[PDB]
Amino acid sequence: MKLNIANPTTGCQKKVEIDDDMKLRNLYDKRISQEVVGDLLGEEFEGYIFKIMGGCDKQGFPMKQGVLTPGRVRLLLHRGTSCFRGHGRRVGERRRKSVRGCIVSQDLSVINLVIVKKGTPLTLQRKRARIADKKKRIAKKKSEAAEYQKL
Amino acid sequence: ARGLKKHLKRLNAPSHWMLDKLGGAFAPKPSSGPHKARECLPLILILRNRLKYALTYREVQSILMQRHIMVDGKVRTDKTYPAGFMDIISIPKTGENYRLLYDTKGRFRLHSVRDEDAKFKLCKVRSVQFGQKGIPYLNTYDGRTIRYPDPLIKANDTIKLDLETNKIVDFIKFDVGNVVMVTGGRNTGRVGVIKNREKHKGTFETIHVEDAQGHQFATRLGNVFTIGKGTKPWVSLPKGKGIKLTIIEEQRKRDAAAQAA
Amino acid sequence: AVTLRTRKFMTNRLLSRKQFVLEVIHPGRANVSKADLKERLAKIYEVKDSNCIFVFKFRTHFGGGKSTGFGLIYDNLEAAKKFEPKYRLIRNGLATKVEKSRKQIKERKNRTK
RNA sequence: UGAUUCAUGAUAACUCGACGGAUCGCACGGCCUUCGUGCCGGCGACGCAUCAUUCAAAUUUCUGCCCUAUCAACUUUCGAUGGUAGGAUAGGGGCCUACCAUGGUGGUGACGGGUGACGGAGAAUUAGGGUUCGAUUCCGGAGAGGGAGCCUGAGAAACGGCUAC
RNA sequence: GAAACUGCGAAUGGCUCAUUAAAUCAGUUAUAGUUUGUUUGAUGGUACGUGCUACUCGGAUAACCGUAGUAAUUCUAGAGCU
Ligand SMILES: [Mg+2]
Ligand SMILES: [Mg+2]
Ligand SMILES: [Mg+2]
Ligand SMILES: [Mg+2]
Ligand SMILES: [Mg+2]
Ligand SMILES: [Mg+2]
Ligand SMILES: [Mg+2]
Ligand SMILES: [Mg+2]
Ligand SMILES: [Mg+2]
Ligand SMILES: [Mg+2]
Ligand SMILES: [Mg+2]
């Protein structure tokens, strides 16, 4: 409903407010990262194409890619994957978190949008140090491996 | 528990440290090292307790962080390093050397020595066996593993070990007729000469050892450690020549020192 | 009239100091102050600088008229800073102290960033 | 070695190989080959891999524990006792699986009940012999409201970690 | 030098005695039936080259900048760097 735009081509992002159903009918009922035609969103987005990807809602539960429902499911999430970014959480810890699904639907509050089409001696010293030190282990090897041989 | 134990409460420490039961709740926990942590003496004890070069746990820490202290030929920073039987403790700043050997009362002594005795230690071999590609090597009871020994050094024998070139410079074939110092039990420290060894198939073997002045005693083969070939030692015996004695005798000695004083 | 008696004296190069037990005999006196005792030791060991003298743990035996204590002499002031407890430096004026507030000390910091 | 088809060697292959340094410090200081941080070459910090050691555990042999028979039989279909082959484990083992046999314990007290029962080192009392206590600072074990299942990790069935009820 | 990524630790200690009656436990055994970060000591060639002596250097992620949602908390999304 509230939309947060960004572009990687320049590096600028901006939040806008829209509330018209027919401007979002082709916005509802789709999924993250699958391209959307820009013309439906209005007459001032032509030529611009958005890759719809990400978004949060009332209750603030982010969309997660790969879960196919306008629902709010309880997933067991590893610290390091999207929608779980615990800090100081004892690696190996998991949680069952609540995340909205990736189907763009009525129940979101903010949609995330991006624009696709605009309208040395150390190494030398240290290297040959090892090589001289590998050659000596066989230097040491032969130095005692034959002294015992005569016995 | 669910893992190792990192604390040593004082009452649980080896009795031969002579730590005092009210001097604190814990003791120095001996770190993993070349000696078996019940037959060792850590560095903390040697500095603060015996030598009194320090007054606290933190002061001995600083001394090692200046690196004045060297053990067995190499400089050791560890506070609770497990020094053991026949180690050498040397402080070049003071220019002093020590062997670690037992009282007749079974407690470690820092035996002051010259430089020429610092060059070497003695070790008894744990076992001799083949290894990678059939390359003969031996285990000592000091953790050390020496590859390419004399084919004569068998199990239980003792070796001289130069700390500079680090290989065998001599060896004693453990057998009857040599002088030995005992490193465990109630007889630990007591030196003497193997008079007999009786084995028992499937058990430990018993060594029979007699003080220079007649007294006869026995241990098991584990606590035996030859010093020299024949009667003569290859190391400097401590303040008492390994001869243990009755309680009456040291009572007599004080009053005998108390008749001259 | 007091007499100053140092026993169990041993000089270690490892911490670059000389250590001993001080016995002070002080008839008539309640107790000799460490500042006053500071001076007498500096004038018996020729230390050239009165600040490398550190004494503590005075016991003042039953009956009066005698006290024990412990004394540290360093030969370098630089040494007297590295190998010394930071509070014993304060006792000789070489430093000053601070306090804490236990609340907040880390608990809400751990939550912030 | 008390005792091993042991240690260890040779050979024939097999693996979708964990591995076998693209890392970091000060200190300079011998001498040119193009006189070119120039060829060197030091001491160290961290790291990977095998064996040994150490700090440890995990199982494990023998003997040993209070009161009770108004508790004389208990276990065994569906593991109870053994066998063989596997599976799993870090590894032995009915630990688990398939097939087979009919075993295992018991008046020397099995099985079952009570315990205001964690075990020991110990404590009170003590002519001796004893009687009673031992939650508690040392050692061993077990638990974190009750059960259970796990992740990470060398090590946890962890709770000042997680998941479910 | 702070933050932050990375590595290690947090499996020790502290507390208690509920369950538990050959069980835990004690003395005494065994592992040739096992794992073992760490310490200490030793050890380490071949990757492909048709082993006739080494064969080239990948993006992307914190701290940071900035847009935000949720009443919500070391809840959480998207873009720009390194
Ligand atoms: Mg320790
Ligand atoms: Mg079977
Ligand atoms: Mg089997
Ligand atoms: Mg109970
Ligand atoms: Mg109770
Ligand atoms: Mg409670
Ligand atoms: Mg537990
Ligand atoms: Mg739990
Ligand atoms: Mg708590
Ligand atoms: Mg504990
Ligand atoms: Mg090593």
mmCIF file of all heavy atoms in Angstrom, chain D residues 97-109:
data_model
loop_
_atom_site.group_PDB
_atom_site.id
_atom_site.type_symbol
_atom_site.label_atom_id
_atom_site.label_comp_id
_atom_site.label_asym_id
_atom_site.label_seq_id
_atom_site.Cartn_x
_atom_site.Cartn_y
_atom_site.Cartn_z
ATOM 1 P P U D 97 14.071 -55.117 17.960
ATOM 2 O OP1 U D 97 12.626 -54.843 17.887
ATOM 3 O OP2 U D 97 14.576 -56.170 18.865
ATOM 4 O "O5'" U D 97 14.568 -55.470 16.492
ATOM 5 C "C5'" U D 97 13.966 -54.894 15.344
ATOM 6 C "C4'" U D 97 14.614 -55.399 14.078
ATOM 7 O "O4'" U D 97 16.053 -55.276 14.183
ATOM 8 C "C3'" U D 97 14.397 -56.867 13.749
ATOM 9 O "O3'" U D 97 13.162 -57.107 13.113
ATOM 10 C "C2'" U D 97 15.584 -57.193 12.863
ATOM 11 O "O2'" U D 97 15.353 -56.748 11.537
ATOM 12 C "C1'" U D 97 16.678 -56.323 13.476
ATOM 13 N N1 U D 97 17.549 -57.083 14.395
ATOM 14 C C2 U D 97 18.421 -57.972 13.824
ATOM 15 O O2 U D 97 18.485 -58.146 12.627
ATOM 16 N N3 U D 97 19.223 -58.656 14.687
ATOM 17 C C4 U D 97 19.228 -58.531 16.054
ATOM 18 O O4 U D 97 20.002 -59.212 16.716
ATOM 19 C C5 U D 97 18.301 -57.587 16.580
ATOM 20 C C6 U D 97 17.514 -56.907 15.750
ATOM 21 P P A D 98 12.256 -58.343 13.558
ATOM 22 O OP1 A D 98 10.876 -58.056 13.127
ATOM 23 O OP2 A D 98 12.538 -58.597 14.983
ATOM 24 O "O5'" A D 98 12.803 -59.564 12.691
ATOM 25 C "C5'" A D 98 12.728 -59.549 11.275
ATOM 26 C "C4'" A D 98 13.564 -60.639 10.655
ATOM 27 O "O4'" A D 98 14.968 -60.349 10.821
ATOM 28 C "C3'" A D 98 13.398 -62.025 11.243
ATOM 29 O "O3'" A D 98 12.267 -62.690 10.720
ATOM 30 C "C2'" A D 98 14.710 -62.706 10.881
ATOM 31 O "O2'" A D 98 14.674 -63.187 9.548
ATOM 32 C "C1'" A D 98 15.697 -61.546 10.953
ATOM 33 N N9 A D 98 16.434 -61.485 12.225
ATOM 34 C C8 A D 98 16.138 -60.646 13.259
ATOM 35 N N7 A D 98 16.946 -60.748 14.269
ATOM 36 C C5 A D 98 17.844 -61.713 13.873
ATOM 37 C C6 A D 98 18.950 -62.263 14.524
ATOM 38 N N6 A D 98 19.327 -61.898 15.741
ATOM 39 N N1 A D 98 19.653 -63.209 13.876
ATOM 40 C C2 A D 98 19.257 -63.569 12.652
ATOM 41 N N3 A D 98 18.232 -63.117 11.937
ATOM 42 C C4 A D 98 17.553 -62.179 12.612
ATOM 43 P P C D 99 11.530 -63.821 11.571
ATOM 44 O OP1 C D 99 10.415 -64.338 10.750
ATOM 45 O OP2 C D 99 11.277 -63.290 12.922
ATOM 46 O "O5'" C D 99 12.601 -64.989 11.669
ATOM 47 C "C5'" C D 99 12.768 -65.900 10.597
ATOM 48 C "C4'" C D 99 13.959 -66.794 10.809
ATOM 49 O "O4'" C D 99 15.141 -65.992 11.051
ATOM 50 C "C3'" C D 99 13.903 -67.712 12.013
ATOM 51 O "O3'" C D 99 13.116 -68.869 11.806
ATOM 52 C "C2'" C D 99 15.369 -68.017 12.252
ATOM 53 O "O2'" C D 99 15.835 -68.969 11.308
ATOM 54 C "C1'" C D 99 16.006 -66.672 11.933
ATOM 55 N N1 C D 99 16.190 -65.856 13.151
ATOM 56 C C2 C D 99 17.273 -66.149 13.975
ATOM 57 O O2 C D 99 18.021 -67.072 13.643
ATOM 58 N N3 C D 99 17.475 -65.433 15.093
ATOM 59 C C4 C D 99 16.635 -64.460 15.396
ATOM 60 N N4 C D 99 16.859 -63.768 16.506
ATOM 61 C C5 C D 99 15.525 -64.137 14.583
ATOM 62 C C6 C D 99 15.338 -64.850 13.478
ATOM 63 P P C D 100 12.428 -69.600 13.057
ATOM 64 O OP1 C D 100 11.656 -70.740 12.529
ATOM 65 O OP2 C D 100 11.746 -68.583 13.884
ATOM 66 O "O5'" C D 100 13.649 -70.180 13.896
ATOM 67 C "C5'" C D 100 14.463 -71.211 13.368
ATOM 68 C "C4'" C D 100 15.600 -71.562 14.291
ATOM 69 O "O4'" C D 100 16.439 -70.406 14.516
ATOM 70 C "C3'" C D 100 15.224 -72.005 15.689
ATOM 71 O "O3'" C D 100 14.778 -73.345 15.746
ATOM 72 C "C2'" C D 100 16.512 -71.764 16.456
ATOM 73 O "O2'" C D 100 17.453 -72.792 16.198
ATOM 74 C "C1'" C D 100 17.021 -70.486 15.799
ATOM 75 N N1 C D 100 16.660 -69.289 16.583
ATOM 76 C C2 C D 100 17.460 -68.988 17.676
ATOM 77 O O2 C D 100 18.426 -69.715 17.925
ATOM 78 N N3 C D 100 17.171 -67.914 18.428
ATOM 79 C C4 C D 100 16.128 -67.159 18.118
ATOM 80 N N4 C D 100 15.883 -66.101 18.890
ATOM 81 C C5 C D 100 15.289 -67.452 17.012
ATOM 82 C C6 C D 100 15.588 -68.515 16.274
ATOM 83 P P A D 101 13.709 -73.783 16.859
ATOM 84 O OP1 A D 101 13.214 -75.139 16.530
ATOM 85 O OP2 A D 101 12.773 -72.650 17.036
ATOM 86 O "O5'" A D 101 14.562 -73.901 18.194
ATOM 87 C "C5'" A D 101 15.518 -74.932 18.360
ATOM 88 C "C4'" A D 101 16.409 -74.656 19.541
ATOM 89 O "O4'" A D 101 16.935 -73.316 19.433
ATOM 90 C "C3'" A D 101 15.740 -74.681 20.907
ATOM 91 O "O3'" A D 101 15.627 -75.994 21.426
ATOM 92 C "C2'" A D 101 16.643 -73.785 21.744
ATOM 93 O "O2'" A D 101 17.774 -74.504 22.209
ATOM 94 C "C1'" A D 101 17.129 -72.771 20.716
ATOM 95 N N9 A D 101 16.467 -71.464 20.795
ATOM 96 C C8 A D 101 15.635 -70.873 19.890
ATOM 97 N N7 A D 101 15.248 -69.681 20.235
ATOM 98 C C5 A D 101 15.891 -69.469 21.441
ATOM 99 C C6 A D 101 15.906 -68.398 22.334
ATOM 100 N N6 A D 101 15.235 -67.267 22.146
ATOM 101 N N1 A D 101 16.653 -68.517 23.445
ATOM 102 C C2 A D 101 17.335 -69.640 23.638
ATOM 103 N N3 A D 101 17.401 -70.713 22.878
ATOM 104 C C4 A D 101 16.647 -70.557 21.790
ATOM 105 P P U D 102 14.391 -76.404 22.362
ATOM 106 O OP1 U D 102 14.571 -77.818 22.749
ATOM 107 O OP2 U D 102 13.144 -75.989 21.687
ATOM 108 O "O5'" U D 102 14.585 -75.534 23.679
ATOM 109 C "C5'" U D 102 15.741 -75.694 24.495
ATOM 110 C "C4'" U D 102 15.792 -74.695 25.630
ATOM 111 O "O4'" U D 102 15.665 -73.341 25.112
ATOM 112 C "C3'" U D 102 14.698 -74.849 26.687
ATOM 113 O "O3'" U D 102 15.234 -74.531 27.967
ATOM 114 C "C2'" U D 102 13.710 -73.763 26.296
ATOM 115 O "O2'" U D 102 12.887 -73.320 27.346
ATOM 116 C "C1'" U D 102 14.653 -72.672 25.828
ATOM 117 N N1 U D 102 14.032 -71.643 24.986
ATOM 118 C C2 U D 102 14.040 -70.380 25.520
ATOM 119 O O2 U D 102 14.541 -70.152 26.594
ATOM 120 N N3 U D 102 13.457 -69.407 24.760
ATOM 121 C C4 U D 102 12.868 -69.582 23.537
ATOM 122 O O4 U D 102 12.376 -68.616 22.959
ATOM 123 C C5 U D 102 12.892 -70.921 23.056
ATOM 124 C C6 U D 102 13.456 -71.890 23.777
ATOM 125 P P G D 103 16.011 -75.633 28.831
ATOM 126 O OP1 G D 103 16.296 -76.793 27.968
ATOM 127 O OP2 G D 103 15.298 -75.814 30.109
ATOM 128 O "O5'" G D 103 17.394 -74.934 29.164
ATOM 129 C "C5'" G D 103 17.463 -73.862 30.086
ATOM 130 C "C4'" G D 103 17.944 -72.595 29.435
ATOM 131 O "O4'" G D 103 16.899 -72.070 28.580
ATOM 132 C "C3'" G D 103 18.253 -71.463 30.396
ATOM 133 O "O3'" G D 103 19.574 -71.528 30.894
ATOM 134 C "C2'" G D 103 17.981 -70.223 29.566
ATOM 135 O "O2'" G D 103 19.067 -69.954 28.699
ATOM 136 C "C1'" G D 103 16.798 -70.678 28.730
ATOM 137 N N9 G D 103 15.515 -70.415 29.401
ATOM 138 C C8 G D 103 14.554 -71.367 29.583
ATOM 139 N N7 G D 103 13.503 -70.926 30.195
ATOM 140 C C5 G D 103 13.788 -69.601 30.430
ATOM 141 C C6 G D 103 13.003 -68.630 31.066
ATOM 142 O O6 G D 103 11.881 -68.760 31.553
ATOM 143 N N1 G D 103 13.643 -67.409 31.111
ATOM 144 C C2 G D 103 14.882 -67.159 30.608
ATOM 145 N N2 G D 103 15.314 -65.911 30.761
ATOM 146 N N3 G D 103 15.631 -68.056 30.008
ATOM 147 C C4 G D 103 15.024 -69.255 29.950
ATOM 148 P P G D 104 19.855 -71.443 32.467
ATOM 149 O OP1 G D 104 21.273 -71.783 32.681
ATOM 150 O OP2 G D 104 18.816 -72.202 33.180
ATOM 151 O "O5'" G D 104 19.615 -69.914 32.818
ATOM 152 C "C5'" G D 104 20.466 -68.898 32.325
ATOM 153 C "C4'" G D 104 20.049 -67.554 32.858
ATOM 154 O "O4'" G D 104 18.786 -67.170 32.261
ATOM 155 C "C3'" G D 104 19.776 -67.507 34.346
ATOM 156 O "O3'" G D 104 20.948 -67.376 35.119
ATOM 157 C "C2'" G D 104 18.813 -66.339 34.468
ATOM 158 O "O2'" G D 104 19.499 -65.106 34.349
ATOM 159 C "C1'" G D 104 17.973 -66.530 33.219
ATOM 160 N N9 G D 104 16.811 -67.398 33.483
ATOM 161 C C8 G D 104 16.620 -68.692 33.080
ATOM 162 N N7 G D 104 15.487 -69.180 33.481
ATOM 163 C C5 G D 104 14.900 -68.150 34.190
ATOM 164 C C6 G D 104 13.660 -68.088 34.856
ATOM 165 O O6 G D 104 12.799 -68.968 34.963
ATOM 166 N N1 G D 104 13.464 -66.854 35.444
ATOM 167 C C2 G D 104 14.347 -65.809 35.391
ATOM 168 N N2 G D 104 14.009 -64.680 36.013
ATOM 169 N N3 G D 104 15.502 -65.854 34.774
ATOM 170 C C4 G D 104 15.704 -67.048 34.197
ATOM 171 P P U D 105 21.072 -68.147 36.512
ATOM 172 O OP1 U D 105 22.452 -67.972 36.994
ATOM 173 O OP2 U D 105 20.507 -69.505 36.383
ATOM 174 O "O5'" U D 105 20.133 -67.314 37.475
ATOM 175 C "C5'" U D 105 20.412 -65.956 37.751
ATOM 176 C "C4'" U D 105 19.377 -65.367 38.663
ATOM 177 O "O4'" U D 105 18.109 -65.256 37.971
ATOM 178 C "C3'" U D 105 19.031 -66.173 39.897
ATOM 179 O "O3'" U D 105 19.993 -66.098 40.928
ATOM 180 C "C2'" U D 105 17.676 -65.602 40.269
ATOM 181 O "O2'" U D 105 17.821 -64.314 40.844
ATOM 182 C "C1'" U D 105 17.052 -65.434 38.889
ATOM 183 N N1 U D 105 16.288 -66.635 38.509
ATOM 184 C C2 U D 105 15.071 -66.803 39.112
ATOM 185 O O2 U D 105 14.624 -65.997 39.903
ATOM 186 N N3 U D 105 14.392 -67.934 38.756
ATOM 187 C C4 U D 105 14.807 -68.897 37.879
ATOM 188 O O4 U D 105 14.087 -69.868 37.652
ATOM 189 C C5 U D 105 16.085 -68.656 37.302
ATOM 190 C C6 U D 105 16.767 -67.561 37.629
ATOM 191 P P G D 106 20.248 -67.369 41.868
ATOM 192 O OP1 G D 106 21.407 -67.095 42.730
ATOM 193 O OP2 G D 106 20.248 -68.571 41.017
ATOM 194 O "O5'" G D 106 18.956 -67.439 42.787
ATOM 195 C "C5'" G D 106 18.665 -66.407 43.716
ATOM 196 C "C4'" G D 106 17.296 -66.579 44.318
ATOM 197 O "O4'" G D 106 16.306 -66.662 43.267
ATOM 198 C "C3'" G D 106 17.067 -67.839 45.128
ATOM 199 O "O3'" G D 106 17.576 -67.744 46.441
ATOM 200 C "C2'" G D 106 15.557 -67.982 45.081
ATOM 201 O "O2'" G D 106 14.940 -67.087 45.987
ATOM 202 C "C1'" G D 106 15.256 -67.508 43.665
ATOM 203 N N9 G D 106 15.197 -68.633 42.728
ATOM 204 C C8 G D 106 16.143 -68.969 41.808
ATOM 205 N N7 G D 106 15.822 -70.026 41.130
ATOM 206 C C5 G D 106 14.593 -70.399 41.639
ATOM 207 C C6 G D 106 13.751 -71.472 41.292
ATOM 208 O O6 G D 106 13.931 -72.338 40.434
ATOM 209 N N1 G D 106 12.597 -71.486 42.052
ATOM 210 C C2 G D 106 12.295 -70.583 43.027
ATOM 211 N N2 G D 106 11.132 -70.771 43.649
ATOM 212 N N3 G D 106 13.070 -69.578 43.362
ATOM 213 C C4 G D 106 14.191 -69.549 42.627
ATOM 214 P P G D 107 18.320 -68.985 47.124
ATOM 215 O OP1 G D 107 19.755 -68.925 46.783
ATOM 216 O OP2 G D 107 17.566 -70.226 46.878
ATOM 217 O "O5'" G D 107 18.208 -68.665 48.670
ATOM 218 C "C5'" G D 107 16.945 -68.503 49.298
ATOM 219 C "C4'" G D 107 17.012 -68.903 50.745
ATOM 220 O "O4'" G D 107 15.759 -68.549 51.376
ATOM 221 C "C3'" G D 107 17.211 -70.400 50.976
ATOM 222 O "O3'" G D 107 18.110 -70.707 52.054
ATOM 223 C "C2'" G D 107 15.808 -70.891 51.306
ATOM 224 O "O2'" G D 107 15.775 -72.028 52.139
ATOM 225 C "C1'" G D 107 15.196 -69.681 51.996
ATOM 226 N N9 G D 107 13.740 -69.604 51.869
ATOM 227 C C8 G D 107 12.881 -69.296 52.886
ATOM 228 N N7 G D 107 11.634 -69.301 52.531
ATOM 229 C C5 G D 107 11.666 -69.635 51.192
ATOM 230 C C6 G D 107 10.606 -69.796 50.279
ATOM 231 O O6 G D 107 9.401 -69.656 50.490
ATOM 232 N N1 G D 107 11.049 -70.133 49.014
ATOM 233 C C2 G D 107 12.357 -70.309 48.677
ATOM 234 N N2 G D 107 12.600 -70.641 47.404
ATOM 235 N N3 G D 107 13.357 -70.163 49.519
ATOM 236 C C4 G D 107 12.952 -69.827 50.759
ATOM 237 P P U D 108 18.719 -69.617 53.069
ATOM 238 O OP1 U D 108 19.593 -70.381 53.975
ATOM 239 O OP2 U D 108 17.682 -68.748 53.660
ATOM 240 O "O5'" U D 108 19.712 -68.735 52.208
ATOM 241 C "C5'" U D 108 20.229 -67.520 52.743
ATOM 242 C "C4'" U D 108 21.201 -66.864 51.801
ATOM 243 O "O4'" U D 108 22.455 -67.595 51.832
ATOM 244 C "C3'" U D 108 20.755 -66.834 50.343
ATOM 245 O "O3'" U D 108 21.175 -65.615 49.725
ATOM 246 C "C2'" U D 108 21.499 -68.026 49.740
ATOM 247 O "O2'" U D 108 21.729 -67.947 48.352
ATOM 248 C "C1'" U D 108 22.801 -68.013 50.530
ATOM 249 N N1 U D 108 23.442 -69.327 50.636
ATOM 250 C C2 U D 108 24.603 -69.534 49.937
ATOM 251 O O2 U D 108 25.106 -68.676 49.249
ATOM 252 N N3 U D 108 25.153 -70.776 50.064
ATOM 253 C C4 U D 108 24.666 -71.820 50.809
ATOM 254 O O4 U D 108 25.283 -72.880 50.828
ATOM 255 C C5 U D 108 23.459 -71.535 51.510
ATOM 256 C C6 U D 108 22.901 -70.327 51.402
ATOM 257 P P G D 109 20.399 -64.235 50.008
ATOM 258 O OP1 G D 109 21.388 -63.157 49.870
ATOM 259 O OP2 G D 109 19.596 -64.336 51.239
ATOM 260 O "O5'" G D 109 19.384 -64.063 48.799
ATOM 261 C "C5'" G D 109 18.448 -65.085 48.469
ATOM 262 C "C4'" G D 109 17.043 -64.551 48.395
ATOM 263 O "O4'" G D 109 16.212 -65.299 49.324
ATOM 264 C "C3'" G D 109 16.895 -63.080 48.767
ATOM 265 O "O3'" G D 109 15.912 -62.451 47.948
ATOM 266 C "C2'" G D 109 16.403 -63.141 50.203
ATOM 267 O "O2'" G D 109 15.657 -62.023 50.618
ATOM 268 C "C1'" G D 109 15.559 -64.407 50.197
ATOM 269 N N9 G D 109 15.452 -65.009 51.529
ATOM 270 C C8 G D 109 16.481 -65.180 52.408
ATOM 271 N N7 G D 109 16.115 -65.696 53.539
ATOM 272 C C5 G D 109 14.753 -65.857 53.410
ATOM 273 C C6 G D 109 13.815 -66.375 54.325
ATOM 274 O O6 G D 109 14.004 -66.807 55.463
ATOM 275 N N1 G D 109 12.537 -66.373 53.806
ATOM 276 C C2 G D 109 12.203 -65.927 52.564
ATOM 277 N N2 G D 109 10.908 -66.019 52.256
ATOM 278 N N3 G D 109 13.069 -65.439 51.697
ATOM 279 C C4 G D 109 14.323 -65.433 52.182
#
